Swiss-Prot record, chains A, B, C, D, E, F:
One of its GO terms (molecular function) is iron ion binding. One of its GO terms (cellular component) is cytoplasmic vesicle. PROSITE patterns: FERRITIN_1, FERRITIN_2, FERRITIN_LIKE. It comes from Equus caballus (Horse). Keywords: Acetylation, Cytoplasm, Cytoplasmic vesicle, Iron, Iron storage, Lysosome, Metal-binding. The keyword Mitochondrion does not apply. The keyword Cytoplasm applies. The lineage of its organism: Eukaryota, Metazoa, Chordata, Craniata, Vertebrata. It comes from the Eukaryota. One of its GO terms (biological process) is intracellular iron ion homeostasis. This is Ferritin light chain.
Length: 174, 174, 174, 174, 174, 174
């Protein structure tokens, strides 16, 4: 703004910019996961699709946060997007564990920003997160956990066979 | 879980299990109310329908709570369902008063769990209740109060005639 | 009633109330089974769906029994619903065995009530059970037995893999 | 009520009546703005439409607040509606500045009532405001600010020409 | 204007502004009536709907008057809207009597303005009122009188029963 | 691969990874441009849309490059995405100049990679670029140049008025 800004603290404004960076980094990590599973020597198309769709979801979250920054009169500021933590992601099990770790770290950042906004008596911020992010993250984390249990069930013995079956029979593919 | 659980206190987990029990008990009480009004010596079909639909609503609430328990990584635990407080429910007026008492007790339990979750800095829980339960209860309680006033208006004099008219002209029936 | 009651013994009236309780307890047991399989550390969606649909079927049976109680002029009386026998249900095999045990106990109660009604020369009761319950139970018990054999075939060796395949390829899921 | 009222403080009840008055006063101010721009010596049809639609929006907000007062068992009490602050509203720029001032004052009243309700542990009130008012106000204030910037851009030089172009090319008209 | 004003006296211009105020005050009185009948301790939905629709009709009349003020080149001037005469409105009979009193006072103001305009040889004003207001008021007053007679017929004896029947069987409701 | 890789040099593989980084950096720069023009103190919706659509186009280019990396048996490797060169982007003219600079730098990188691939006798790479990138860049650069000329024509005198008109009459908006 400063023509529209009202009840929007500098602390929240900066934390929103940080959360945009976290969501875009998550979207980048998922881009990397997706194309790893499209390698000809990995070749699990369902897994690739699963992570490519999450890359899109996380970019959308970032964009909603940026829209909101501007609705409140804050200034979007971008930082570098750190490269993902790995160049190769292992098995579907390794990948799904890394994804759940990533999601829990995003969820904690959401929770932290909600607490700041509730502290700052910023109910628009708090409801924004409640309405568009918190349940999306709980639903995604539950789906990931369900996947992890199924993958684990499958790859106790006959790990190859189990990885193929999960990709074929649980994950969406052509 | 414990693979997905995050920011979900044992206190909230137990209170959610208790609230499931309260909703299922309410659904049972409404089952009983419904079939009481289907007796050939009571025979108020609109009233029966009204309570049978509330039995379904309260079971749905319980099921949403149980879904949520699992989304958060808590463990659903069931207790006995206590039989309803009465075997015979009197007149439509008596029944509607009992229903409003029941609803207010469910609403207070919701309010209590919201307070616990807000105390515990559990905004997913608080929003879950706000989004799916609190306004449903306020709307139902208002409808019940509107009914009670109409029933009372009718059964001051000519109590039989008034009970019949309310069932015929206010409540949904075939 | 007592304006409509005809050829409807106190013994049958009480046994019908007991059978309503048994069906509602079975529906509760299936609720518990269903949500157990929705746990993130169990995560067998087909199995959850299978038991949640049986919860609905058993509640419907109870409701038909209650309708019938009132059609005959008897008085519905509700008792407590005892909590299910277990809080955690083990593997799909354990669960399906428990379900078959439960069904056989409901079937025996049906058979017992049919015998009482035939003894009491109550052909409406006997036909009611024949028409709406006995073949439903035989068909369900046969489906359960078919499932049990398939589960057993699968989990002799590679128990995880087999549990996943059964849920994926036999049970209805999204 | 007092048959339905639960967890609804006298402080909130009175503040809701005050907020109804503020919304209806805002709707009146917008009525005046609208018809000012319909004057033959002002004659900016888009601007008239813009303010007449806001008059309707603010009346709708008041009506939702009054519905809610009754849902909670409070008593609606009306006060006079003070005449708008001006009889003539100047240029589109003057008018849009006055509108943003008005909106910010409504938003602050919303924020104030949210704080009271959160203080009073009234989560239905707080969610009611979050769900139906706070983001509507943030979205409207942002649209007004976007308009103000465009109007300002236009009327630096050639103020007549710029006022006409904004009305023609930004605002909805026939 | 003063570019368009022709044959439009200052006396008529001021009386039109006064009549706008009277119509908006009537619309406010009807808002209050409407929400009174939506109270849970009043609870006559047809009556609420009846008065809420009249609130809309009276606002529309005010808006047509304001449009006309501007068509003729007069200047709309707004005054405060006085709060309604009562905070609680009694029975349907009391309310309908108050409404007929209100309508007759609006009708007299219309008649008075018609006389002024005919005196001033302002046939556009006179026809405007004839075409859009006078018969609308006569039709509404007749409907109110028909209602009053029916309410009176009903609440001679068994006043509660009669109030319920009128709302149910005469007034439009869901 | 290395099961599928054929005629695909390490030099091309690395240059493709670099070009992915350049396209994703361009997409990030356009994200920033887009949200700058959505600021309430900038407020040029057409310009925002124009840059947000380019953010999507550049991400799509990166994704096609990554698909191709894997089709050829190379290994995608991601680096950090450097933050954009500016935090605030000035006027539409400044922004469009920065965009043309950015595009020309991407085009040169395409040309450079084409030369490498033609040097390496890698006709699949060369045709891939010819078919999916080179004419897309020439068409975009021409559109940008057409825009720049129009913006310049407009903001010689009356820079505000001209910026508004270009956004309104050239760029796609709601
Ligand atoms: C330090 C600031 C402060 O007041 N405090 C509380 C903020 N509130 C919450 O974290 C919270 C969480 C969930 C629901 C609520 O309604 C709620 O207030 C701090 O953290
Ligand atoms: C004891 C725990 C605590 O902090 N305290 C406050 C919890 N907050 C609320 O009850 C409440 C109610 C409605 C809206 C809110 O935003 C809100 O924080 C306790 O009860
Ligand atoms: C004790 C009461 C009595 O008479 N006796 C027989 C009831 N009949 C049956 O059990 C039966 C079962 C299946 C078909 C029939 O037609 C039928 O009579 C007792 O159990
Ligand atoms: C004085 C009453 C009180 O407890 N205190 C806090 C009320 N809470 C908030 O204002 C608030 C704002 C935004 C989100 C929340 O969750 C929240 O509790 C007072 O103002
Ligand atoms: C004082 C002004 C004047 O001339 N006089 C008459 C106005 N005319 C009427 O009141 C009237 C009413 C109905 C139909 C007509 O055609 C008509 O002229 C005054 O009141
Ligand atoms: C150094 C490698 C080499 O041979 N040399 C030529 C590559 N060819 C081209 O750059 C080119 C450009 C456009 C169309 C062609 O058909 C074509 O060969 C080097 O740069």
């Amino acid at each position: 703004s400063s023509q529209i800004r009202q009840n929007y603290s500098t602390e929240v404004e900066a934390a929103v910019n940080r959360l945009v960076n976290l969501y875009l980094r998550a979207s980048y990590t998922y881009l990397s996961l997706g194309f790893y599973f499209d390698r000809d020597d990995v070749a699990l198309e369902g897994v690739c699709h699963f992570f490519r769709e999450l890359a899109e979801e996380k970019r959308e979250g970032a964009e909603r946060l940026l829209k909101m920054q501007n609705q409140r009169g804050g200034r979007a500021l971008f930082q570098d997007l750190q490269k993902p933590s790995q160049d190769e992601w292992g098995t579907t099990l390794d990948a799904m564990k890394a994804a759940i770790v990533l999601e829990k770290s995003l969820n904690q950042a959401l929770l932290d920003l909600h607490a700041l906004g509730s502290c700052q008596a910023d109910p628009h911020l708090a409801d924004f997160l409640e309405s568009h992010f918190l349940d999306e993250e709980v639903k995604l984390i539950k789906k990931m956990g369900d996947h992890l249990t199924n993958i684990q069930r499958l790859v106790g013995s006959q790990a190859g066979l189990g990885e193929y079956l999960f990709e074929r029979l649980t994950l969406k593919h052509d």
